[PDB]
Design a protein around this ligand. Structure first.
Ligand SMILES: [Mg+2]
Ligand SMILES: [Mg+2]
Lengths: 224, 226
């Protein structure tokens, strides 16, 4: 069974997720704070991490930040919220792959964890090398992007999304298609694609507009 | 005179390594992706392969996975960027024999290729009889490890490490001794390769029981029961 590490400082929530994930067929490790999470992720390399944000000792954004800083691309789904002020999440920018807002039904978590694992296990490899869209160069196998020769600092899932868009440059890919290709969903009511699209547009334009949102149709990377 | 196949999708790096290895005495073949690598390895069997992990068409992990599935034990050193930890570890886990991180100086690669060739296909051990360590049996001639009667699936270099440790059962061997005995190194190296493999090996042994593979901090590693 895939090993899922669940991290939450609320012991009731932690036990409830542990039980439900185990009954859904996962091997489950648990951690009560970010320090314990990092220890567990080290001792027992999990296939995916479900990570609460607000915790003592070391919080969830710090855990994501540390994992990514250490070149650990383990799939991470954060249990977060959108700020009230300023609609930020709150772990995604720092490097998490997906999110869920409490309270949530277990089926929503299971669906997201299976998607995390489906992406993680994918061995599909493109023939694409470096793809050019105006001033943007996307080195697909090298996982680097530059705009006018200047590196664009992207998270793993920001780059995964940019990569798919560039593999199909000039094509309009719908939210459902991107949920499938980039997040590995096979089922959803989530805004996570739209959020990440906004992240990419902001980083890419830090510039002509290269990433377009075509309302009711989808998203497209194309030299304006 | 030994034939080395070098594989990298960065044409500048590929060209540099081709030049440098040829000057250093090797017959060099090149490939730009994993499909070209498999074709080259198939059509003119190299003595060693230097293999970039991240490439289009077929990546280095897939290359190694294919070679090992076909029971081709050709030595492979995988290359990767410093930050691409997960990728090079994946290539080691899939069966590669060593790694080198980019960027590197050519001497570091030449040294690792000479080592690969020294330790290609058979171990610095002479035991014939299967060696027992509690529930573990290491049959060096048969290249088989079993724990409580069930095979442990090890890569070639994982098995090489276990075989040296079992030949020297109960004895502590240091990281530098293991680089020389298992990896064939004759030079000082900055590498985590021994630790990486000790980890994979330990995880596989522990598998179904007792810890048999012990790390003696500051001293080395030892295979023994209890
Ligand atoms: Mg909390
Ligand atoms: Mg490459």
């Amino acid at each position: 069974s895939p090993r899922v590490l669940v991290v939450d400082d609320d012991s009731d929530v932690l036990a409830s997720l542990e039980r439900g994930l185990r009954l859904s067929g996962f091997e489950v490790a648990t951690a009560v704070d970010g320090a314990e999470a990092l220890r567990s992720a080290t001792e027992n390399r999990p296939d995916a991490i479900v990570l609460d944000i607000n915790m003592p000792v070391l919080d969830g954004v710090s855990v994501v930040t540390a994992l990514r800083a250490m070149d650990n691309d383990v799939p991470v789904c954060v249990l977060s919220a959108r700020s009230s002020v300023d609609d930020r999440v709150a772990g995604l920018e720092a490097g998490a792959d997906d999110y869920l807002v409490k309270p949530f039904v277990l089926a929503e978590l299971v669906a997201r964890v299976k998607a995390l694992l489906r992406r993680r296990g994918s061995t599909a490899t493109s023939s694409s090398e470096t793809i050019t869209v105006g001033p943007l160069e996307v080195d697909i196998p090298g996982r680097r992007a530059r705009v006018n020769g200047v590196d664009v600092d992207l998270t793993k899932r920001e780059f995964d999304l940019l990569a798919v868009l560039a593999e199909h440059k000039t094509a309009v890919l719908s939210r459902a298609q991107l949920l499938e290709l980039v997040w590995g969903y096979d089922f959803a009511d989530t805004n996570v694609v739209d959020v990440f699209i906004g992240y990419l547009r902001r980083k890419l334009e830090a510039g002509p507009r290269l990433l377009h949102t075509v309302r009711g149709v989808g998203f497209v990377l194309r030299m304006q």
